[PDB]
C-alpha cells in the first residue's frame, strides 16, 4: 500500500494476519522482504483512530498474535532470516512490542510471557554474542523499563523472577537457585538494572510513575522488590528517616518559638535590642527562612526533574504540593516584613499552620499511621470536596433566606447570618438568635428544616459514606504504604550528601562463572532464602 | 400517583413557582406576608440548585444518593 | 493526628493575638479543644487584627478537625 | 421491562446467507484481536412513535426494570 492509512501493508503482513502458514511459507519463498515495515497511521497507537499497534514488522505480528509456528520459521528460514534485533520507526524490538500488547489479563498475559521467553531462548540460539534484553527504544527504554513504566506487572513479574533449566540458557536466568538443603532453599536475584543503573533504574520508574500507570501500587509487591527495599529501609534509610523527621521536628518548633514572641510594635522591620531573649528571637527567624528558602528550592527541583503535565502536577505528589506551598506563604511573609507592612503576620500564620500540618507527611512509613494519613487524603479530594459542595449550598441558601426575613436587626447581614446558621453544624447553632422580624413560623420553619437537612441528614451521611469508603480504600492504602516507602528510599539515596557507596547493596557475587564465551558473569545478586515442603 | 412517587425535580421547580407567584399576589395585594412567600421560593431555589448535579459523573450519584436518603432514612427515622 | 492538628492552629491563632485576655498557648489551645466536644465559640476574642485571617483559620480548623477526622475516626473505628 | 429480550435483540447477530439482513449487529473490519462492530440504531434514537429511549425514559416508574435497561450496550455509549 502506498496510502498513508495502510502504507507498507504488504502480502507477508496479510499472511500472517489470516494464520496461513502455507502462503507465508510460499511468499518467504517467493523474496517477500521479511523486514518490510508497515508503517502507516492504521498500525500506530493513534488513540484518536482506530488501529492495532504490533511493532510494524511481520516477526512482530507472529509474535503478538500467538503464532510461535511464524515466528520460529521467520527467524529460522533458508530464503531470508529475520533480523531479531530489527526496530520499528519508534525503535522498538520484537519484545518491546510484546510488552506494548500486555494488559495484565491471565489469557493476554500467559503467552505474553511464554513467547517472551521463547524469543529469548532463539535469540540465544542464532545469537549468542547479542543481548536483546539491552536495546533500548526511541524513548531509552528497555523491555524491563518499558514494561516498568507502562504497569504491565504480568511481565514484569515474570521477567525479574525468570529462571531457565537447560544448558546454554542459563545466562538468560535473572533468579537462580545457589545451594539448597531439603526443605530450604537460597535464590539469587539479579539485581541489574533494578537498584541502580543509567537511566530507568526499575524502582525510579515505578515510584516516580506519572500516577495514571495502571499497577503501580501493585508492582513494589513483587518479590524481589520487596524485599530490596525492606532491606534499603533497615540498612540505610531507616536511620536517616528518622533523623530527618527530627531536624523537621526542630524546625518547627524553633519556627513557633520564633512566631510566638513577635514584637507587637508597629510598622516592620523592628530594631534587635540589646538582650538575651532578641538575640534568640532573630536567630530563630532566620533559622525559619532558611528552611523556607530550602524546602521552595526543593519544591523547584521536584517540579523540573519530574515535569508533571499540569494534571499530574496535581493529583499526585500532593505533600510536595504541601511543601511547596508552606514555603511560598513563608517567603511572602518575608517579602512583606520587609516591605515595612504588618500584614506579613497574616502569611506567617499560614506557614506555620503548613508546617505543623505537613508533620503529617513522616507519618508515612510507619505501617498503621500511614494508611490513617492516606486515607485523610483521599477523603478531603473526594467525600469532603462533594459535602462542600452540597452543604455549602444548603447553607447559602438558608443563609439568603433568613437575612431575607430579618429586618433592621443586628444580623441583618450575609456574614452574620451565614456564621450563625454555620453554628448549628458544630453543635452551638442558638435557634432563636433574633427577634427582628415578622411572621415568626416562617423563621422557625426556616431554621428547622435547614438543621434537619444538613445536621441530621447531611452529617451523618457523610459519615455513612466515609464508612463506606474506608472499607473500599485499605488495601490501596496498604499498598500506597510500600509505594511511599520506595521513594523515600530512592530519595535518600540520590541525595545522599556525602558521597556514601554502601547504599549499593547485595554484593557481587558470582551467578554461573560461564557466559557464552568463558568468562564468568558477576551481577549483584541479592539472596533471598525460602523454605518448601512440596517437591523434595 | 406517578405524580408523587416519581418525578421529584419537576414538583420542586413548580413548587418553587408557585411560591413566587404567590409573593407576587401578596405584593401587589398590599399585604406584608409576601415576604413569608419569597423566602420560602428562596430557599427552594438554592436547594433546587442540585438538580443540576446530574450531569457530573461524581455530584450525580451524590444527589442521587441524598435523595435516596431522604426518602427512607430520614422519613422512617423522623417519624 | 489530631493532637498534630489541635497544636498546630493553636500556634497559629496565638501568634495572631496579641496583647488579649488569652493570648496564651494554653488558653488558646482549650479554647480551640472546646470546638471538639461541641462547645466552641467561634467568636471568642477581637484582640487582634485580620479578622478574615482569623476567621479563615477557625474556619480551616473546624472542617479539618471536628468535620473530617471524626468522622474518619467513626468510620476507621467500625473497619475495627 | 424485559431487558433480557431487549439485550437480545440490540445486538442480534446471524451469521447465514440470506438472513444477515436480519442482524442487528456487524462486523465491518477485524485485523487481529481488534475488530469494529456496528450496531443499526433503527427507532433507537428516534422512531415515528416509540423510539426506545423514548419509551425506556418516559415510562411510568412501575417498569420492573426501567434503570437497568440503559446498561445495555448500544444505548449506554448512544446516550454519551
Ligand atoms: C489541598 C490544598 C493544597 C490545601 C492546602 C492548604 C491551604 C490547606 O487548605 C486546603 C483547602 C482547605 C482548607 C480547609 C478545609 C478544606 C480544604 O486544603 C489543603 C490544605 C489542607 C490541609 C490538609 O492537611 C494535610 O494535608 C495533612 C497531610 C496529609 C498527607 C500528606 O501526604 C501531607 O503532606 C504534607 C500532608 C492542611 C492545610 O494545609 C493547613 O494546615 C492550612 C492552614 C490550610 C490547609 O488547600
Ligand atoms: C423548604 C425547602 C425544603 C427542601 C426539600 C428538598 C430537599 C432536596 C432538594 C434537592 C433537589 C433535588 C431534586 O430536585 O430532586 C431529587 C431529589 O428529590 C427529593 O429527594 C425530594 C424529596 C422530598 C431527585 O429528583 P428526580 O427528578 O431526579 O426524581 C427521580 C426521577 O427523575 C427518576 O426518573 C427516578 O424515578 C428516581 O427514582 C426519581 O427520584
Redesign the pocket.
Known sequence: YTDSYYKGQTALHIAIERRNMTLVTLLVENGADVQAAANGDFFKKTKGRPGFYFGELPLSLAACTNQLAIVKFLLQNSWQPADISARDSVGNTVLHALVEVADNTVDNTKFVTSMYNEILILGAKLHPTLKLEEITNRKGLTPLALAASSGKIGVLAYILQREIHEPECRHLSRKFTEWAYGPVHSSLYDLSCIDTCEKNSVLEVIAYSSSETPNRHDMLLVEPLNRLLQDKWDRFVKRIFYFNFFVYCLYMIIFTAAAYYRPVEGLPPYKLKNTVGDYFRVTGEILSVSGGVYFFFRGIQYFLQRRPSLKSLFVDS??????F??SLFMLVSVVLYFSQRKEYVASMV?SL??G??????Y??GFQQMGIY??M??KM??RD??RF?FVYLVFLFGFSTAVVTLIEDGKYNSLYSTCLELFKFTIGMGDLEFTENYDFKAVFIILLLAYVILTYILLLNMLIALMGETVNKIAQESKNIWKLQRAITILDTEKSFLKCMRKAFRSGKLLQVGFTPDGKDDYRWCFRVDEVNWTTW
Open positions: 500532593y505533600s510536595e504540593i504541601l511543601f506551598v508552606q499560614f499552620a503548613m505543623w500540618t505537613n508533620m503529617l507527611y507519618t508515612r494519613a492516606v485523610i487524603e478531603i479530594l469532603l470536596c462542600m
